[PDB]
Amino acid sequence: SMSVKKPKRDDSKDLALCSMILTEMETHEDAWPFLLPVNLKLVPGYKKVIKKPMDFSTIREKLSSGQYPNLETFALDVRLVFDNCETFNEDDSDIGRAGHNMRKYFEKKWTDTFK
């Protein structure tokens, strides 16, 4: 509360460490469904159904331009990528499996780096 604060966590490396995680997600072989924004002209249903599209290129540009105020907003956009994928794709499809795999990969790196 006012004039009453928990000890200050060192957050000076968060930006660098989120960039490294993101690099590792970008270079995973199952990243291909997530690298670029879904083409809303060419994929029927996507525009109407997925209210907040998100992809790795968009996260990279937000990251690079100071549009994440903290590491929780970064994680929210990563998770959004996978939540969108689950909304639109059957579990038993290449893309569906890609999204489960990438989410697992992310969550491990996130835990190991920050928890």
Side-chain angles (χ1 to χ4, degrees), residues 1-7 9-12 14-114:
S1 74
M2 196 187 321
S3 310
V4 180
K5 289 304 182 320
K6 292 194 181 58
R9 190 189 165 262
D10 182 12
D11 62 342
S12 64
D14 288 358
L15 182 62
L17 287 163
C18 291
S19 180
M20 291 169 49
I21 293 172
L22 181 60
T23 296
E24 293 165 358
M25 277 192 311
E26 293 163 333
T27 57
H28 192 296
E29 69 164 291
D30 299 342
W32 60 269
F34 314 114
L35 291 176
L36 299 175
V38 174
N39 186 330
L40 300 181
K41 304 163 187 292
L42 306 184
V43 178
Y46 207 84
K47 193 173 202 295
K48 186 62 178 277
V49 171
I50 298 296
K51 301 307 182 172
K52 292 167 82 168
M54 187 54 56
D55 69 285
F56 294 171
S57 75
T58 302
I59 298 174
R60 168 71 70 190
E61 182 60 36
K62 289 178 66 169
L63 194 62
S64 295
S65 61
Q67 295 185 61
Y68 293 114
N70 55 49
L71 82 170
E72 305 314 326
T73 59
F74 172 78
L76 280 165
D77 267 1
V78 178
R79 290 166 180 151
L80 177 59
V81 172
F82 309 126
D83 295 344
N84 289 346
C85 181
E86 281 196 53
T87 296
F88 210 77
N89 297 262
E90 281 292 342
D91 294 343
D92 188 6
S93 63
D94 298 95
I95 294 172
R97 273 183 293 278
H100 290 293
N101 284 357
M102 293 304 305
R103 179 196 299 273
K104 187 83 169 183
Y105 189 73
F106 172 67
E107 293 299 351
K108 170 90 157 77
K109 309 275 184 192
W110 192 247
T111 292
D112 291 355
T113 302
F114 296 113

